C-alpha cells in the first residue's frame, strides 16, 4: 500500500538476525518464532481473499478459493468451516440462533477485523512471553 517496501539504509535480513538473536537470548525458542511467522504468512495470504456477492445481504466466497485454502493450511484449520463463517454469520436473537450470510463489504471488513485481532493477540502473547522472561521471582522493593 505504501509503495516503498524497502527503507533506505535498512537491511531486513540483518533485522531478522537481531530479532532471532534477541528472542533466543530472552528464552523464546525458534518454534514460537516459526509459529509467529506462520501466522503472519497466513494473514498475508488471507488479505488476498476476493469476495463474490450474491446480493447486498448475502455473499459467498468463490468455490475452491486458493487464498483461503492456503490460509487454512497455514493455520492448520478446516477450510469449509472458515469458508462458511467468512460467508455467513451466526446471529443470536432473544430466543433463536440462526445463520445468515453477510454483506460482501461487511465480509471484507470482518476479515480485516479478524486479521487485526489475530495480530493483536499474537503481539500480546509475545509481550506476555517477554514478561515471563523478564519477571523476577525476588520481590521488587521498588521500580523505575
Amino acid at each position: 500500500q505504501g509503495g516503498s517496501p524497502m527503507i533506505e539504509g535498512v537491511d531486513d535480513a540483518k533485522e531478522m538476525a537481531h530479532t532471532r538473536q534477541a528472542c533466543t537470548l530472552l528464552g523464546i525458542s525458534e518454534s514460537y518464532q516459526m509459529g509467529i511467522f506462520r501466522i503472519l504468512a497466513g494473514i498475508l495470504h488471507l488479505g488476498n481473499v476476493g469476495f463474490a456477492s450474491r446480493d447486498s445481504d448475502s455473499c459467498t466466497i468463490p468455490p475452491k478459493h486458493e487464498p483461503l485454502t492456503i490460509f487454512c493450511d497455514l493455520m492448520g484449520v478446516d477450510y469449509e468451516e472458515m469458508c462458511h463463517w467468512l460467508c455467513h454469520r451466526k446471529l443470536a436473537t432473544a430466543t433463536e440462533t440462526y445463520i445468515k450470510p453477510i454483506s460482501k463489504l461487511q465480509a471484507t471488513n470482518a476479515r480485516d477485523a479478524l486479521a487485526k485481532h489475530i495480530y493483536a493477540k499474537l503481539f500480546n502473547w509475545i509481550v506476555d512471553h517477554v514478561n515471563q522472561a523478564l519477571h523476577s521471582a525476588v520481590k521488587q522493593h521498588s521500580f523505575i
Binding site: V77, M82, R89, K90, L91, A92, Q106, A113
Partner: protein, 66 residues
Amino acid sequence: HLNKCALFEKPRMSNKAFIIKHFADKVEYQCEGFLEKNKDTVFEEQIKVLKSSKFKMLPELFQDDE
C-alpha cells in the same frame, strides 16, 4: 454540547466535523472514522467458533485468565 464551554467549537462549513479546544491547542476532528474504528463487530458465537479452530495455539491466544 450546546456550546456549553469554549472547549467545544462548532465548524459551520462542515457538519461532519467538530472542533475541540485544548489548553495546549485547538484542533478539528473529522467524524467519518470515529464510528468505524470504535465499533468492532464480534460475536460471542463467533468467539466460540474461533475457539473451535484446529490451531492448537489459537484458543491459547483467545484464552482469558481471570
